[PDB]
Structure 1
Amino acid sequence: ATILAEQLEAFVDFDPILLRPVDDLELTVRSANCLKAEAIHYIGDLVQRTEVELLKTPNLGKKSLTEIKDVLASRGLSLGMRLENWPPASIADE
C-alpha cells in the first residue's frame, strides 16, 4: 500500500496607590496594620519580598494571603518582582 499511495501523490495535489502608605489603601482591618511593623511602609517593598517568610513572621496570619494577592493579581505584579523606581525621598512610619 506504499507502492500504491506513491502513485497518487501527483494527484492529491504610574499606579497611584503603589505610591501610597499601606494604612490608607482601603483594605480590611488586619491586612494593613501588620505590614508597617516589618519595614514595609509602602506597597513597593511588599511585592519584592519572599512570601515564604513574610506571612510566617509573628505578625501576619493566614487570612492575609488573599488581600495581598488581590492587589498582586490585577495590575500584573509578580512574587518577588523587582521594580524600576518605587521609593521617593519621603519615607515615614506611625
Structure 2
Amino acid sequence: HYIGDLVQRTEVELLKTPNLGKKSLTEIKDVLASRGLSLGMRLENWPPASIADE
C-alpha cells in the first residue's frame, strides 16, 4: 500500500508478476518519472535514518 515497499523491490522484480498489465507499466514509468518511486531501492525492513521513531 505504501510506495516505499514498492521501492523495496526493483521494478524488474515487479515485472516478474502478471498482476501488472500493459497500461500498468505505463503508469509505473509515469509515477517513477517524478524521481520519487521505483528507482530500485532497498531498505532493511521499513525505516531509514530519518524514518526514526521520533
Q: TM-score, normalised by structure 1?
A: 0.36
Q: Number of aligned residue pairs: give it.
A: 54
- For the aligned residue pairs, the C-alpha RMSD in angstroms reads 6.2
Greater radius of gyration (CA): 1
Tell me how far apart the structure 2 counterparts of residues 92 and 61 of structure 1 sit (CA, whole Å).
36
Bigger relative contact order, structure 1 or 2 (CA pairs below 8 A, ≥6 apart):
2
- Percent identity among equivalent residues? 100
Runs (4+) of structure 1 exceeding 4 A deviation are 83-94
5+ long unaligned stretches in structure 1 = 1-40
Q: Is the 8 A contact 1:55 1:61 kept in 2?
A: no
The answer to whether the 8 Å contact 2:10/2:38 transfers is no
Q: TM-score, normalised by structure 2?
A: 0.50
Aligned partner of residue 53 in structure 1, secondary structure: helix
Listed as ranges, the gaps of 5+ residues in structure 2 are none
